[model samples]
Target: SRKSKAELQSEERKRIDELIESGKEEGMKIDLIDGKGRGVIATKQFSRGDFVVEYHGDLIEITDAKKREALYAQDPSTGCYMYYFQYLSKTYCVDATRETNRLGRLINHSKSGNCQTKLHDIDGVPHLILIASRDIAAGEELLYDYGDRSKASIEAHPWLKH
Candidate 1:
């Protein structure tokens, strides 16, 4: 009952896609981490390159993304959940602002974290995926580098300096 290397990789790809459609994300738990509002905990093992979860949200044009940001700005205590990236030289934002039972958005940031954000495409439409950056054990917090190096964000969240 041995599987080829390529075959296993292919199977994992299919499995991840299936999970994305269902929104029944596996192996992660939402926990209230100390000072952090909410964070994700890995309840199962994951090897490097494993597709942990998708940052499920509405993918919108950067124009409306800013409009949405403007509204969130009116409430200073609101959390930032927008993920912006350039695709095909055009900008897009994955707005996870709307509350959902999604763990990806609840995951916090770490300068060197165990998971990373990856842009996965499904039928030519890009999706935000969180992947294991290293082999992870159970009960570990799933954090990743947001890669925000701007003065504004760092000053806004003093904890980002860590």
Candidate 2:
């Protein structure tokens, strides 16, 4: 049966809370029951097409200034080359991901995961919505298509940035 967005969101919150409790209890660890892979698990059953979590990370792009400048001044603050780099305008950097966002960090990749995540503008911050692609049984570890979470989910920075 299909669930409304509200129903799905409510369920997601419940599950997220459950997972948070478990994560705090065990120092933030979860077991993969179906052998897909182990990660921080949500403690509630997720329906098909339910929003899960957001991918939070910093994006780096090369600019023209660094190329032209000879003795580029770097920000002693960021420790990067002295150049003008812009923060992502339409995205929110939440405090979850190692200072940016850690929602994706908690999920393991699957070629075909039962759930998936998408970025949505919530207030000023972008929230990762985890949705179920199929019916997920309770106690089963929720999984997501890692490819969806990355520029190259499998090849680059799949799990977490080092």
Most accurate candidate by TM-score: 1
Off by over 4 Å in 2: 1-29, 32-38, 54-104, 152-162
lDDT tens digits by residue: candidate 2, 1-162: 598989977776776555433432221235655554436666666556654544433333233322322233332323121111123553222222233224345556677777766544434343455567887666555566655334422222234454
Q: List the residue pairs that clash in candidate 1.
A: none
lDDT of 2 at 74: 38
Residue-level lDDT for 135 in candidate 2: 74
Model 1 misplaced stretches (Cα beyond 4 Å): 1-10, 148-162
State each model's CA lDDT, in order.
0.81, 0.46
TM-score of each model, in listed order = 0.82, 0.44
lDDT of 1 by residue, 20-52 (tens): 889888898989878887889999999998889
Residue 24 alpha-carbon offset, candidate 2, angstroms: 12
Output the TM-score of candidate 1. Answer: 0.82
